[PDB]
Amino acid sequence: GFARLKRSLLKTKENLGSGFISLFRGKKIDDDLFEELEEQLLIADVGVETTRKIITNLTEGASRKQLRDAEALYGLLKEEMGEILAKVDEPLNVEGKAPFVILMVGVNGVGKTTTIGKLARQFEQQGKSVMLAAGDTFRAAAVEQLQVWGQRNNIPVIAQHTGADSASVIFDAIQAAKARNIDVLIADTAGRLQNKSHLMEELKKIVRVMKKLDVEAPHEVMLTIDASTGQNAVSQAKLFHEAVGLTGITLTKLDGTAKGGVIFSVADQFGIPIRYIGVGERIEDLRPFKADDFIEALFARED
Amino acid sequence: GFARLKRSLLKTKENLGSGFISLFRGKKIDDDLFEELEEQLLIADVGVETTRKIITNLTEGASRKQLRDAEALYGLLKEEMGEILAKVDEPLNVEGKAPFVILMVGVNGVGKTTTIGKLARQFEQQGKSVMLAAGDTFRAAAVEQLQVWGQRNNIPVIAQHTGADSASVIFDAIQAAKARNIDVLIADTAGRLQNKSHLMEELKKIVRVMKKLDVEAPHEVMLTIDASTGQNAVSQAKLFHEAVGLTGITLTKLDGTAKGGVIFSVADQFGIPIRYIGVGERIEDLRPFKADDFIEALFAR
Ligand code: NA
Ligand code: NA
Ligand code: NA
Ligand code: NA
Ligand code: NA
Ligand code: NA
Ligand code: NA
Ligand code: NA
Numbered sequence: 001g002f003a004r005l006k007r008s009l010l011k012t013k014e015n016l017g018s019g020f021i022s023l024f025r026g027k028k029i030d031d032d033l034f035e036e037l038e039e040q041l042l043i044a045d046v047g048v049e050t051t052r053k054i055i056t057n058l059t060e061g062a063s064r065k066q067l068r069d070a071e072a073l074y075g076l077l078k079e080e081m082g083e084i085l086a087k088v089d090e091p092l093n094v095e096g097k098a099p100f101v102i103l104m105v106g107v108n109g110v111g112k113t114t115t116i117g118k119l120a121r122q123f124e125q126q127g128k129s130v131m132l133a134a135g136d137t138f139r140a141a142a143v144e145q146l147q148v149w150g151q152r153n154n155i156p157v158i159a160q161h162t163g164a165d166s167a168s169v170i171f172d173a174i175q176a177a178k179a180r181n182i183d184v185l186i187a188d189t190a191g192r193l194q195n196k197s198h199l200m201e202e203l204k205k206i207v208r209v210m211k212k213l214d215v216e217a218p219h220e221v222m223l224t225i226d227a228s229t230g231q232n233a234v235s236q237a238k239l240f241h242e243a244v245g246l247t248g249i250t251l252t253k254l255d256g257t258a259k260g261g262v263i264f265s266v267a268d269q270f271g272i273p274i275r276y277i278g279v280g281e282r283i284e285d286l287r288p289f290k291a292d293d294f295i296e297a298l299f300a301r302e303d
Numbered sequence: 304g305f306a307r308l309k310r311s312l313l314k315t316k317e318n319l320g321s322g323f324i325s326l327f328r329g330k331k332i333d334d335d336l337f338e339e340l341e342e343q344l345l346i347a348d349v350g351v352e353t354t355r356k357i358i359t360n361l362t363e364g365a366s367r368k369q370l371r372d373a374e375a376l377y378g379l380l381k382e383e384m385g386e387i388l389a390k391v392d393e394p395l396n397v398e399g400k401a402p403f404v405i406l407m408v409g410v411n412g413v414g415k416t417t418t419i420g421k422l423a424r425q426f427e428q429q430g431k432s433v434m435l436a437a438g439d440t441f442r443a444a445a446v447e448q449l450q451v452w453g454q455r456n457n458i459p460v461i462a463q464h465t466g467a468d469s470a471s472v473i474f475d476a477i478q479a480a481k482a483r484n485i486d487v488l489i490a491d492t493a494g495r496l497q498n499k500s501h502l503m504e505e506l507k508k509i510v511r512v513m514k515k516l517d518v519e520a521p522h523e524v525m526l527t528i529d530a531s532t533g534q535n536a537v538s539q540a541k542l543f544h545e546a547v548g549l550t551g552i553t554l555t556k557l558d559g560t561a562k563g564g565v566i567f568s569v570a571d572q573f574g575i576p577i578r579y580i581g582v583g584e585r586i587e588d589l590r591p592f593k594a595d596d597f598i599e600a601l602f603a604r
Contacts, residue, residue: 001392003593004305095369125604127327127374284599302394303591 005297008279012260015044017298020077024070029062033070044258045230047265054080078299084264085291090273092220092248092288094123099131099177099185101210103170103218105203105240108136108191111252111278112224113145116186118286119276120155128183133173134159135166135189135206146188156180166190166202167209174213187218200243207244222248222275225266228257234265241270250286252278263294308600311582315563318347320601323380327373332365336373347564348533353571357383381602384567388577388594391570395523395551395578395591397426402434402480402488404513406473406521408506408543411494413529416445418553419489420452421589422579426487427456434483436476436490437462438469438509449491459483469493469505470512477516490521496542503546510547525551525578528569531560537568544573553589555581566597 006013013019023040027033034055041051054077061067061076094100102119106112120130132150134143140162150157158173170187177185189206190199210217223246225233233251240246249272254260267274274289309316316322326343330336337358344354357380364379397403405422409415416439423433435453439445443465453460461476473490480488492509495502513520526549528536536554543549552575557563570577577592 001389001394002595004595004599093368095371125374126378127372284603302396303593 001302002293002297002300003303005279005293006300006303008255009260009297011256011258012044012254013298014258015040016046016081016261017078017295018301020074020299021071021301024073027070029067029070029073033073034059037073041261044261045265046261047231047234047269050084050265050268053268074299078295081264081298082291082295084267085274085294087271088249088267088274089289089291090275092222092273092275094128094184094220097183097216097219099174099182100219101174101177101214101217102184102186102220102222103189103203103206103244104186104222104224105189105244105246106191106224107193107236108139108142109224109226111226111250112188112191113142115224115250115252115276115278115286116146116188117149117153118283120184120186121153121283122286123184124155129181130155131173131177131180131182131185132157133170133185133187135170135173135187136191137164137166137169138162138190138192142188156182167206170206171209171213174210174217178213196239200239203240203244220248220275221246222250223272224250224252226253227251227260227262228253230259230262231265233262234269237266237270237272241272246270246272248273248275250274250276250278251289252286255279255285305596305599305603308582308596309603311558312563312597312600314559314561315347315557316601317561318343319349319384319564320381320598321604322347323377324604327376330373332370332373332376336376337362340376344564348562348568349564350534350537350568350572353387353568356571357387357567377602381598384601385594385598387567387570388597390574391552391577392592392594393576395525395576397431397487397523400486400519400522402477402485403522404477404480404517404520405487405489405523405525406492406506406509406513407489407525407527408492408547408549409494409527410496410539411442413494413527413532413539414555415439415494415527416448416491418527418555418581418589419449419491421586423452423458423487423489424456424586425589427458431486432484433458434476434480434485434488435460436473436488438473438490438492439494440467440469440472441465441493445491459485470508473509474512474516477513477520481516499542499546503543506543506547523551523578524549525553526575527553527555529556530554530563530565531556533562533565534568536565537572540569540573540575544575549573549575551576551578553577553579553581554592555589558582558588 123130134146136142147157160169277289360383426433437446437449450460463472580592582588
């Protein structure tokens with residue numbers, strides 16, 4: 001089963017999940033084994049803190065259960081790592097708001113930009129009217145590309161002049177969305193690396209200004225991160241979560257990267273729902289995250 | 304991949320998957336909508352019982368999620384109908400036995416013999432040593448067809464005179480397979496429905512004789528059914544499963560039939576893994592079943 005996701009995770013499966021099988025084959029459970037396993041988890045971008053927790057729990061379980069052969073660690077790992085992902089399994093529900101406001105945060109990258117477009121198309125296919133807000137106001141090329149995308153897809157895009165106040169653009173977009181019976185408003189934001197404190201103050205202002213129109217907005221603060229960036233995804237998540245407060249995460253570019261193990265670090269460190277994973281180029285390849293599908297694809301050696 | 308499968312399933316997609324889109328466009332979620340959906344599922348040969356389950360789960364899911372637009376039902380249907388197939392998505396693994404024994408069952412006229420030969424060639428191309436047993440002992444053309452596959456591919460075929468005892472042929476074949484270090488043995492069987500009890504008793508006798516040589520044999524009891532026969536495929540599956548017990552299914556002739564929806568009835572009613580699907584007449588057109596490829600192709604918009 002899960003052959004499509006198994007293909008997307010092919011390179012990640014070399015080191016994690018089914019990749020553990022060759023590591024444990026024929027070995028005893030001892031300090032040397034756990035050192036080798038720790039190294040492999042770290043090379044897979046699982047992260048120091050999450051790896052330490054896995055090793056601690058696995059070591060105690062193997063000891064208490066008096067396990068003898070390393071092969072048995074495979075099933076215990078599937079349980080421990082599966083629980084990590086199950087704890088952040090909760091799909092995004094955008095129903096019943098006028099509009100449901102998604103504030104899209106994260107650093108500048110193809111992932112964030114592409115995710116806005118894919119989600120907009122998915123919501124339209126679900127029968128919802130969508131509007132976009134071009135809140136990355138100092139990057140004229142990014143604003144124009146969003147306007148181009150909206151025109152190509154007949155989705156309205158609210159934008160102001162280069163250098164406009166992002167909170168004002170997004171406020172105006174919420175007003176336009178309410179006036180035009182929009183179901184979902186997706187608001188882009190700046191994602192510049194220099195002067196991190198400035199960006200975080202900008203995001204806090206955006207959120208405060210929204211409350212004049214709807215105390216429930218933003219209904220979702222969604223971070224987009226790129227699995228191929230390894231631990232940079234974790235540090236980005238920490239930065240945005242501590243500054244604004246995330247309610248959902250989209251993790252892109254899981255297909256074709258050997259760094260897919262970072263999903264475990266994101267899940268364990270922050271406990272924020274992972275709403276979607278990107279595993280391909282099609283609109284439909286931005287999938288709602290299902291922890292059971294993911295762990296089975298990762299650990300099963302059958303196709 | 305899913306994209307290649309789209310062409311094979313075009314006819315089925317008129318009523319299922321992407322065929323749902325026009326049904327939901329612009330509509331509200333109400334009893335009339337679910338009645339219209341029920342009609343479309345039934346004409347696609349999804350079956351009365353499976354259709355009712357789909358509608359019930361879709362209704363409960365739409366209520367739970369507080370959906371407003373019928374368009375949003377499309378994704379829930381993809382999820383729920385995909386779950387039906389995911390439950391029978393375990394691939395066949397023929398490794399590690401001496402030999403792994405596949406007992407092929409089913410009625411005459413569904414291509415059991417040709418399916419055996421195609422699988423035998425595939426296993427050989429994968430590097431496995433294969434042997435075939437001509438257990439459809441009263442049908443000389445079936446024995447000859449199996450021998451043709453064996454002769455073309457240098458695969459041994461165990462056979463006796465027309466009218467021989469099928470259990471004896473298969474017993475001798477298992478003994479020969481063990482003596483010759485064979486990896487996979489595939490046994491053809493009789494398929495006359497005119498006397499259902501006689502056929503099922505013959506199959507049970509074959510199985511009893513196998514177990515005297517290896518308690519694990521047969522490792523797979525595989526049914527072949529023809530998707531273009533609609534609910535006949537479902538009734539055939541029920542007969543063999545309740546009488547003998549199936550562990551895998553090969554579903555042929557999915558390409559060009561508007562009755563491909565029967566796969567959901569087979570999956571839901573019996574829960575037996577669907578190991579392979581046929582989307583053409585060639586060896587290469589008998590593909591390992593991948594439920595996610597199938598759903599993605601069916602629902603692609
Ligand atoms: Na970590
Ligand atoms: Na309000
Ligand atoms: Na209803
Ligand atoms: Na499968
Ligand atoms: Na062979
Ligand atoms: Na032949
Ligand atoms: Na051949
Ligand atoms: Na058996």
